[PDB]
């Protein structure tokens, strides 16, 4: 079995994309600048 | 394409045929269908392409845990004296209430 | 005049172990009797047929030999010792 992967939250800087979901076990709250509406053509 | 049912059917048929071939003296055939609601079992005698008895929510012993779903058909088969059956492991692998049902044959006469 | 002549190739007919229809339809066959000899599983044993460690088909029990065509094309041949009383 894959080594357990736990719940991680998210925080963005230019979009404030907050989403919590089970994922990789090296991170608890991924804070980044580019996520959600940050890419020039992420809109839509 | 596949709907996770015909794989069960194909495994189930291959294994019942192989186990019928293991014993040259063909006995009554226990084919069991692990349905999503309950578990159905039928005594197909592979000498006339017919069924001797059945057990399911409609036949006997309403929906299966309920080990009597196999117990009743085994009792019907020991009224027929076709024990030591060519017992199919089933396309649905031998786990869960089937573990209760399959050995329900052994506890009720089918000495396979 | 002879002082030597051309050689001979390895081209003479290969003889195998004696095979064929050892038993035929209509006669009772007995257990242990060699009913069919094949080199490679091509003619398939049916019921009550034993396959030894030579791809040699003999009678596991007594019966009658039967060669039947079946399948999608009537091309597959099954040899079977059908249960005829000894």
């Amino acid at each position: 079995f894959h080594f357990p992967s736990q719940s991680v939250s998210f925080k963005c800087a230019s979009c404030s994309n907050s989403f919590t979901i089970e994922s990789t076990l090296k991170q608890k709250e991924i804070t980044i600048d580019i996520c959600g509406k940050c890419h020039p053509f992420y809109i839509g | 394409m596949k709907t996770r049912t015909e794989q069960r059917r194909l495994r189930h048929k291959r294994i019942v045929k192989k186990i019928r071939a293991t014993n040259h003296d063909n006995r009554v055939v226990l084919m069991v269908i692990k349905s999503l609601n309950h578990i159905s079992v039928q005594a197909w005698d592979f000498s006339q392409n017919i069924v001797l008895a059945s057990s399911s929510s409609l036949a006997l012993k309403l929906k299966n845990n309920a080990k009597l779903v196999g117990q009743d058909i085994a009792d019907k088969l020991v009224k027929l004296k076709l024990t030591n059956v060519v017992f199919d492991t089933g396309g649905s692998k031998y786990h869960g209430r089937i573990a209760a049902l399959a050995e329900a044959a052994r506890e009720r006469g089918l000495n396979f | 005049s002879k002082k030597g002549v051309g050689s001979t190739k390895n081209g003479r007919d290969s003889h195998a172990k004696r095979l064929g229809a050892k038993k035929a339809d209509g006669q009772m066959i007995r257990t242990g009797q060699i009913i069919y000899r094949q080199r490679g599983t091509r003619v398939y044993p049916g019921v009550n047929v034993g396959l030894g460690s030579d791809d040699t088909l003999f009678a596991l029990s007594d019966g009658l030999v039967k060669y039947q065509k079946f399948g999608p094309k009537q091309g597959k041949t099954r040899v079977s010792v059908v249960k005829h009383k000894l």
Binding site: H2, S5, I21, Q27, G44 | - | -
Partner: protein
């Protein structure tokens, strides 16, 4: 969680928008495959640990590599010689990784001007292929020494590519 949210409102919206003879011909997803083709691992790139490790990092199932389809001399492998790593994604893990894929990975795609490359096979699949293995924050660019990505694939039981396209359009994926 995207799982229950989608399965309740978005699946029903897709069913009722373009209808069928039932409500189970909805765009269906069997699993999610995550992939790392590393054939130079045999040719001493990092000896197969890179794919296993990083996919395991981005996995939900125990990573199992798959034996090669052929035997080729330009990239040595025969009779097995498992190349790369592969993970299937079922149960919770499907939507668990779809959430990060659609919310985090999508804006970080270098070529993100509308992901409608028609990677459909016309056989009810959608084969997203990216040459940047750094698409999630679940991976650091220190496992492999080559330009690398993933050939992930959305799969459908009843083969219809438009169903996968509808899945794409309704999960904040610009076309």
């Amino acid at each position: 969680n995207l799982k229950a949210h989608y399965q309740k409102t978005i699946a029903k919206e897709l069913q009722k928008s373009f209808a069928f003879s039932s409500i189970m011909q909805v765009p269906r997803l069997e699993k999610i495959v995550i992939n790392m083709g590393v054939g130079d691992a045999i040719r001493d790139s990092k000896f197969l640990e890179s794919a296993l490790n990083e996919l395991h990092l981005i996995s939900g199932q125990k990573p199992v590599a798959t034996k090669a389809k052929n035997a080729i001399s330009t990239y040595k492998l025969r009779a097995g010689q498992l190349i790369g790593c592969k993970v299937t994604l079922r149960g919770e893990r499907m939507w668990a990784f779809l959430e990060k894929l659609i919310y985090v990975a999508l804006p970080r795609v270098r070529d993100f001007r509308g992901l409608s490359l028609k990677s459909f096979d016309g056989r009810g699949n959608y084969t997203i292929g990216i040459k940047e293995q750094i698409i999630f924050p679940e991976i650091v660019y220190d496992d492999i020494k080559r330009i690398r990505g993933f050939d992930v694939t959305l799969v459908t039981s009843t083969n219809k590519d438009s169903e996968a396209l509808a899945l794409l359009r309704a999960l904040n994926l610009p076309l």
